[PDB]
Design an enzyme around this catalytic site. Sequence first.
Site, PDB file in Angstrom:
ATOM      1  CG  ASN A 102      -1.964  -1.144   1.017  1.00 13.24           C
ATOM      2  OD1 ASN A 102      -2.497  -1.261  -0.058  1.00 13.24           O
ATOM      3  ND2 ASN A 102      -2.244  -1.938   2.060  1.00 13.24           N
ATOM      4  CG  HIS A 264      -8.271  -7.741   6.085  1.00 10.84           C
ATOM      5  ND1 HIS A 264      -8.578  -8.246   4.838  1.00 10.84           N
ATOM      6  CD2 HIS A 264      -7.721  -6.525   5.880  1.00 10.84           C
ATOM      7  CE1 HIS A 264      -8.248  -7.359   3.916  1.00 10.84           C
ATOM      8  NE2 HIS A 264      -7.705  -6.315   4.522  1.00 10.84           N
TER       9      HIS A 264
HETATM   10  N1  CTP Z   1      -0.428  -4.671  12.516  1.00 12.54           N
HETATM   11  C1  CTP Z   1      -0.378  -5.171  11.279  1.00 12.54           C
HETATM   12  C2  CTP Z   1      -0.632  -4.344  10.182  1.00 12.54           C
HETATM   13  C3  CTP Z   1      -0.557  -4.900   8.903  1.00 12.54           C
HETATM   14  N2  CTP Z   1      -0.255  -6.235   8.751  1.00 12.54           N
HETATM   15  C4  CTP Z   1      -0.064  -6.816   7.404  1.00 12.54           C
HETATM   16  O1  CTP Z   1       0.609  -5.827   6.562  1.00 12.54           O
HETATM   17  C5  CTP Z   1      -0.172  -5.624   5.377  1.00 12.54           C
HETATM   18  C6  CTP Z   1      -0.111  -4.155   4.966  1.00 12.54           C
HETATM   19  O2  CTP Z   1      -0.718  -3.375   6.023  1.00 12.54           O
HETATM   20  P1  CTP Z   1      -1.760  -2.182   5.743  1.00 12.54           P
HETATM   21  O3  CTP Z   1      -1.068  -1.348   4.722  1.00 12.54           O
HETATM   22  O4  CTP Z   1      -2.105  -1.562   7.072  1.00 12.54           O
HETATM   23  O5  CTP Z   1      -2.941  -2.909   5.016  1.00 12.54           O
HETATM   24  P2  CTP Z   1      -4.407  -2.709   5.537  1.00 12.54           P
HETATM   25  O6  CTP Z   1      -4.569  -1.227   5.348  1.00 12.54           O
HETATM   26  O7  CTP Z   1      -4.539  -3.515   6.833  1.00 12.54           O
HETATM   27  O8  CTP Z   1      -5.324  -3.342   4.376  1.00 12.54           O
HETATM   28  P3  CTP Z   1      -5.180  -4.390   3.214  1.00 12.54           P
HETATM   29  O9  CTP Z   1      -4.509  -5.632   3.755  1.00 12.54           O
HETATM   30  O10 CTP Z   1      -6.617  -4.624   2.949  1.00 12.54           O
HETATM   31  O11 CTP Z   1      -4.441  -3.742   2.070  1.00 12.54           O
HETATM   32  C7  CTP Z   1      -1.565  -6.156   5.707  1.00 12.54           C
HETATM   33  O12 CTP Z   1      -2.240  -6.624   4.535  1.00 12.54           O
HETATM   34  C8  CTP Z   1      -1.319  -7.269   6.722  1.00 12.54           C
HETATM   35  O13 CTP Z   1      -0.999  -8.508   6.078  1.00 12.54           O
HETATM   36  C9  CTP Z   1      -0.016  -7.039   9.880  1.00 12.54           C
HETATM   37  O14 CTP Z   1       0.275  -8.254   9.767  1.00 12.54           O
HETATM   38  N3  CTP Z   1      -0.071  -6.504  11.121  1.00 12.54           N
END
Ligand code: CTP
EC number: 2.4.3.-
Lengths: 290, 279
Positions: A102, A264
């Site tokens: 992202n 999720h």
């Molecule tokens: N505390 C966290 C935050 C994120 N992640 C992982 O890191 C990825 C990227 O995080 P983020 O950019 O915050 O994605 P989200 O916004 O949670 O959404 P999406 O997965 O839907 O893209 C996530 O998909 C997840 O697999 C994780 O394991 N633990």
Amino acid sequence: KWKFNRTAFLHQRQEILQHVDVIKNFSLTKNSVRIGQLMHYDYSSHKYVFSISNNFRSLLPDVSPIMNKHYNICAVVGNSGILTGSQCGQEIDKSDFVFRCNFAPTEAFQRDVGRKTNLTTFNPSILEKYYNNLLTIQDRNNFFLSLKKLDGAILWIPAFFFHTSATVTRTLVDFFVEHRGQLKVQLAWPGNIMQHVNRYWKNKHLSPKRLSTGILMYTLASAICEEIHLYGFWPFGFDPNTREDLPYHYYDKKGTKFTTKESHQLPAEFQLLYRMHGEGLTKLTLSHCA
Amino acid sequence: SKWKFNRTAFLHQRQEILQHVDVIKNFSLTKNSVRIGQLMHYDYSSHKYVFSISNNFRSLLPDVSPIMNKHYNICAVVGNSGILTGSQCGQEIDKSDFVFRCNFAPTEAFQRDVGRKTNLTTFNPSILEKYYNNLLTIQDRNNFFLSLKKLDGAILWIPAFFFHTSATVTRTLVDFFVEHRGQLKVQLAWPGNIMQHVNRYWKNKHLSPKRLSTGILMYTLASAICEEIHLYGFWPFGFDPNTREDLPYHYYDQLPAEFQLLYRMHGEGLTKLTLSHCA
Ligand SMILES: Nc1ccn([C@@H]2O[C@H](COP(=O)(O)OP(=O)(O)OP(=O)(O)O)[C@@H](O)[C@H]2O)c(=O)n1
Ligand SMILES: *[C@@H]1O[C@H](CO[C@@H]2O[C@@H](C)[C@@H](O)[C@@H](O)[C@@H]2O)[C@@H](O[C@@H]2O[C@H](CO)[C@@H](O)[C@H](O)[C@H]2NC(C)=O)[C@H](O)[C@H]1NC(C)=O
Ligand SMILES: Nc1ccn([C@@H]2O[C@H](COP(=O)(O)OP(=O)(O)OP(=O)(O)O)[C@@H](O)[C@H]2O)c(=O)n1
Ligand SMILES: *[C@@H]1O[C@H](CO)[C@@H](O[C@@H]2O[C@H](CO)[C@@H](O)[C@H](O)[C@H]2NC(C)=O)[C@H](O)[C@H]1NC(C)=O
Ligand SMILES: *[C@@H]1O[C@H](CO)[C@@H](O[C@@H]2O[C@H](CO)[C@@H](O)[C@H](O)[C@H]2NC(C)=O)[C@H](O)[C@H]1NC(C)=O
Ligand SMILES: *[C@@H]1O[C@H](CO)[C@@H](O[C@@H]2O[C@H](CO)[C@@H](O)[C@H](O)[C@H]2NC(C)=O)[C@H](O)[C@H]1NC(C)=O
Ligand SMILES: *[C@@H]1O[C@H](CO)[C@@H](O[C@@H]2O[C@H](CO)[C@@H](O)[C@H](O)[C@H]2NC(C)=O)[C@H](O)[C@H]1NC(C)=O
Ligand SMILES: *[C@@H]1O[C@H](CO)[C@@H](O[C@@H]2O[C@H](CO)[C@@H](O)[C@H](O)[C@H]2NC(C)=O)[C@H](O)[C@H]1NC(C)=O
Ligand SMILES: *[C@@H]1O[C@H](CO)[C@@H](O[C@@H]2O[C@H](CO)[C@@H](O)[C@H](O)[C@H]2NC(C)=O)[C@H](O)[C@H]1NC(C)=O
Ligand SMILES: *[C@@H]1O[C@H](CO)[C@@H](O)[C@H](O)[C@H]1NC(C)=O
């Protein structure tokens, strides 16, 4: 302590490849799409559609950007707060190929997360949220500068997951056509792939409404990486070693409380990845790097 | 005693307008008047807002101004005031040689009052947002397509460079038209940055808003191609002129100063401003 089990990892690669043609699903290509083809969205009602223009097609790669590509050590960097203070940046950057999620920020954080980026994911709605829809000269310049910093990395844009991407997708396309040849970034545009990817993980007893971007990147990485090391996968509000409070993201300001806005089952994803770590399939880093 | 056209005075007005504004040119950008990648700015927003002209946008521009060498005798310019409701002006409007309408206003369910003839209608791109759900679904795309088809060969006059809020939806509109190229007979026109130029005539008539309305812009255009202009649906008040009972702002539900001047012009015989039931 952790020991790689190459044969078990390669078995996993083969099983994934039985359900997902990763090299093809990685991106639509020019010869696989027709001008005027109507796309639907993986995660929205079937009524939402998007017509592929000539200009959109002109941004598609000719061949898969990961055709005949091979990287020995890959890092897949999720965005967890566990990375803050980890000093994992050097180790991440020693990888042959680094995947990021992202369009996450590295600038103030490189000591912890590194500076190397070979792929980053990009939901078109980033333009709405952070670039004011490329309305002004300053916005256009800021976006251009963000792209230039990626150099020759892959920008992996899933425009057909969420129907809320539709109008901003035309703005993104038009920006790239306008700037054609000014950037070295490699554009990749997956189509409707999540039905295929969900099938692998459903058999491993992971069936959330939606898989996270992090596990989607693991899935892609499995095809082209010999050994995958995960960083920033820790969907919990405390550090496992020190017990201290953690934010959801490594880039959150100090003191931000952990919250999830889910669709999720991150803890369910984590549990499976952690089992995989124990089996030697992949290395999940949960501590400061040395 | 009846309004009477003063053709001499109107011909003087036409000449004054032309001496201040190049109406045929300002009517629309043309293919060769823009370059791919040119940055357009917006007449009524800060300079910082820009829109880059694409190959596809350029491809929708006419080769030649659609009103070049066109001349019609009796023109109706139909504003969208509620004063038209119950007026039964439809037959008289439709007897005009050429009818200008504003903002894609509906006629079908209102034809007794507003007519069904349309030779030009304006279209702010935000119409897509407001009435066609940004062309997000097959049903929306079909509904917009059918709306366009009903215009037959009329001009659709789309001002995309007045308000910066048009920017994102303009790409949706452009892509729609490119996708349907050759399927519609509608003639597209796309005025550029013209308001400062149009303004120069009206400033001398002591009409001095920040922004001129679509209706008075249409009068300006009409002066170049019409022998005689009749106005309908110009009454920017929520109240009936005679009764003062509530009136909807639109028949299908700055301006007072514009209305005042149009009324003065009516009195001078330059144009006919209809405020009552038609016979
Ligand atoms: N505390 C966290 C935050 C994120 N992640 C992982 O890191 C990825 C990227 O995080 P983020 O950019 O915050 O994605 P989200 O916004 O949670 O959404 P999406 O997965 O839907 O893209 C996530 O998909 C997840 O697999 C994780 O394991 N633990
Ligand atoms: C591909 O990588 C393997 C593994 O390399 C080790 O683990 C990585 C995570 C990183 O820490 C490396 O620096 C480590 O060397 C390589 O296999 C190793 O090769 C070295 C040098 O030839 C050898 O001394 C080790 O015994 C090997 N280790 C293992 C576990 O086999 C392999 O050489 C790499 N191949 C290429 C072409 O880069
Ligand atoms: N009660 C009304 C409504 C409309 N009008 C005239 O009819 C034109 C078209 O009306 P509308 O569709 O309401 O235009 P707006 O959307 O209000 O804004 P703009 O005038 O900028 O198009 C206006 O420009 C105005 O000159 C009028 O005189 N009295
Ligand atoms: C690497 O992983 C494989 C796959 O699980 C291991 O092979 C299994 O070993 C277990 C434990 O003795 C047996 O019960 C299974 O029958 C084996 N399965 C297969 C498919 O071979 C292998 O032992 C692991 N290697 C190391 C060094 O731990
Ligand atoms: C993603 O990969 C899957 C395979 O995992 C593709 O689905 C296959 O596509 C071909 C069509 O050429 C068929 O022969 C197979 O029957 C399909 N398999 C299944 C399981 O449906 C799918 O086309 C790929 N999608 C994209 C967008 O690349
Ligand atoms: C992965 O991306 C990095 C940049 O993030 C590439 O590393 C750079 O390579 C260039 C060109 O050789 C060097 O000049 C830079 O000093 C390197 N930067 C960093 C941060 O290491 C790397 O080549 C890419 N790897 C691939 C594509 O396999
Ligand atoms: C038609 O309009 C013209 C222009 O306003 C009128 O002519 C003017 O009339 C006034 C009053 O008699 C004179 O003081 C001006 O000198 C005239 N100007 C010109 C240029 O002729 C004309 O009277 C109008 N026709 C009518 C009222 O029937
Ligand atoms: C609208 O018409 C006016 C002329 O009435 C055009 O204004 C001229 O534009 C040129 C080139 O930009 C300038 O060099 C002239 O000085 C302008 N003349 C005047 C009187 O201002 C204007 O370009 C037209 N605009 C459009 C978009 O058609
Ligand atoms: C102005 O527009 C109308 C359509 O609204 C045109 O009138 C139509 O002409 C066609 C083609 O001959 C006929 O089939 C229709 O019956 C007419 N419709 C109506 C409502 O009259 C009219 O020709 C246009 N005028 C000009 C000068 O272009
Ligand atoms: C123009 O309209 C007027 C007013 O009804 C009429 O008298 C005249 O003959 C029309 N036609 C032409 C060609 O002037």
